[PDB]
């Protein structure tokens, strides 16, 4: 008997515990709000035929007026946002930003750092384990759409067990050819192309006939509570920008292809609820980072 698991779900590293309180949460909300005004100031500059709208936006974000002989960096808030993002990813990252600096930057705009007033859908499909008997090959490829390739070289039909965890809300399975799937201690129905199932129900048994390989595609949806200012497209771009800039370059940590995989992998840890709150705050910080760095490249 062999077992297989998703690659992105292996060994989630611990996340940081700093910059989670109310003042730090409001700093991230202010940074997101002010960085958004920076991007919109470009369109205002085009319409107004002048750089005054951009100068006003940068002055509020950086406490200093822009210069022509200096490369625009963002000043204290840019430095604070960058260092705070580093601390969120790993517990080994230092917490360099002082509290006093965080409170001063959090007073720039009026926001509430409530990160539980909305939700988002995360599409990473968790396959905790797939148990197959001898003379059966199982390969799991993919993270957003997981394709499971199954081959039965044995004499008779085999029973393969799926375990999708206890966190995902729904999972939809679509097979290359019609197949049979049922819960444990349940009878099997007629072969169908598509199955919709709740992972909380229990481990699922799929009957593998002997012959050509059977491939099953898995798509899952998970609901995680996020602030109302959350935007998945901006968060995903911020994740790639931060990884390129080396903000995640620190020893004894894991690397993920997308923010979708990062948050779901942390949610499936030993105590994944503790890390979901920090990961969401990292998402808002990354959304602020993508806007800030696209307006002020460096």
């Amino acid at each position: 008997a062999n077992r297989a698991t998703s690659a992105f779900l292996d060994n989630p590293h611990p996340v940081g515990v700093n910059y989670v309180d109310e003042g730090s949460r409001q700093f991230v909300a202010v940074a997101e709000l002010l960085a958004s005004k920076l991007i919109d100031s470009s369109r205002e500059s085009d319409e107004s035929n002048s750089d005054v709208p951009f100068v006003q936006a940068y002055s509020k974000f950086a406490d200093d007026n822009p210069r022509h002989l200096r490369v625009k960096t963002g000043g204290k808030m840019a430095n604070a946002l960058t260092n705070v993002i580093r601390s969120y990813y790993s517990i080994n990252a230092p917490a360099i930003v002082p509290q006093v600096e965080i409170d001063r930057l959090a007073s720039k705009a009026t926001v509430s750092g409530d990160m539980y007033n909305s939700y988002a859908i995360f599409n990473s499909v968790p396959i905790v384990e797939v148990l197959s008997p001898a003379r059966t090959t199982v390969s799991i490829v993919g993270s957003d759409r997981a394709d499971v390739t199954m081959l039965n070289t044995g004499a008779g039909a085999a029973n393969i067990t799926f375990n999708f965890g206890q966190i995902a809300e729904t999972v939809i399975l679509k097979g290359s050819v019609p197949f049979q799937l049922a819960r444990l201690n349940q009878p099997m129905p007629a072969a169908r192309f598509t199955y919709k199932l709740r992972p909380l129900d229990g481990p699922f048994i799929v009957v593998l006939p002997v012959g050509n390989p059977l491939v099953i595609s898995a798509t899952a949806a998970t609901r995680i509570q996020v602030p109302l200012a959350f935007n998945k497209a901006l968060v995903e771009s911020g994740f790639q920008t931060a990884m390129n800039d080396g903000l995640f370059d620190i020893q004894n940590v894991n690397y993920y292809s997308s923010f979708d995989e990062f948050i779901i992998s942390q949610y499936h840890a030993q105590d994944g609820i503790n890390r979901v709150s920090t990961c969401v705050i990292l998402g808002l910080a990354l959304q602020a980072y993508d806007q800030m760095r696209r307006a002020l490249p460096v």
Binding site: E47, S48, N49, Q56, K60
Partner: protein
């Protein structure tokens, strides 16, 4: 407070009307008596002009040309033109002034 104000959802119609007129002032400048580019040329250079209206020696072009008689036309910003010294030799051929109203 003046520059950090956020527009309410129920903006009064007077604000929208003033915003509309201000936008048209910046965008369609020719309707109000100002432009952004002018051309100064000697009288012995003949440039195609907008002849629809029938004016004699019409000072109106459909668009200020980037080439005249197959030759690129000089473009000078108003700032450099102000500090220029040999303006008599420069005006002996054409040039386009921009970066000013």
């Amino acid at each position: 407070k003046l520059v950090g104000h956020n527009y309410p959802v129920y903006v009064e119609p007077v604000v929208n009307i003033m915003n509309f007129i201000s936008a048209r002032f910046v965008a369609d400048s020719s309707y109000f008596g100002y432009t952004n580019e002018i051309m100064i040329m000697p009288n012995h250079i003949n440039v195609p002009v907008d002849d629809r209206f029938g004016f004699r020696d019409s000072p109106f072009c459909t668009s200020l040309p980037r080439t005249i008689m197959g030759n690129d036309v000089r473009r000078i910003s108003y700032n450099v033109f102000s500090m220029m010294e040999d303006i008599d030799d420069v005006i002996s051929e054409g040039f386009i002034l921009y970066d000013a109203y």
